[PDB]
């Protein structure tokens, strides 16, 4: 499917919820919203890093230790 | 002021909070459809005063609530 580039807000968040490696929700007025991130899609790559199969905490660590600009590929 | 919401199939009404204040609303949720507002403090849930309670207690009240959740905000 597709590749979405987002920018962390002033709280360090791009604006989505996930569980089991899949995006379940998008936050109103967020970079995920503005950039067209879609729910019910599995996350494949974050900043060039394959996250298929990683635990949610490992994904969350990648996202939290990423810089301001976060690019995610989804399927 | 007082907003009535219904939990979805995952048991959520559609908002994020921290330090007793609503910080985000989730797209296509009960909170969005019913006009829950960000950057407002949570005062009551299901008629119980929650001003001053810690976040884990507020979260506990929300999770233990039945399907209909009414929140008063200010």
């Amino acid at each position: 499917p597709r590749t979405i580039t987002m920018h962390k807000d002033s709280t360090g968040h791009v604006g989505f919820i996930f569980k089991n490696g899949k995006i379940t929700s998008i936050v109103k007025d967020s970079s995920a919203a503005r950039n067209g991130l879609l729910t019910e899609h599995n996350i494949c790559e974050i900043n060039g890093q394959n996250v298929i199969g990683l635990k949610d905490s490992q994904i969350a660590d990648i996202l939290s230790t990423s810089g301001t600009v976060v690019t995610i590929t989804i399927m | 002021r007082t907003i009535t919401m219904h939990k979805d199939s995952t048991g959520h009404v559609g908002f994020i909070f921290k330090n007793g204040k609503i910080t985000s609303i989730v797209k296509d949720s009960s909170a969005a459809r019913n006009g829950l507002l960000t950057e407002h403090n949570i005062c009551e849930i299901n008629g119980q005063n929650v001003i001053g309670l810690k976040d884990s207690q507020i979260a506990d009240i929300l999770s233990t609530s039945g399907t209909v959740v009414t929140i008063t905000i200010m």
């Binding site: 939290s64 | 908002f15 994020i16 909070f17 884990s56 999770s63």
Partner: peptide
């Protein structure tokens, strides 16, 4: 961090 989803 330390945010809650409800």
């Amino acid at each position: 961090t330390n945010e809650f989803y409800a």
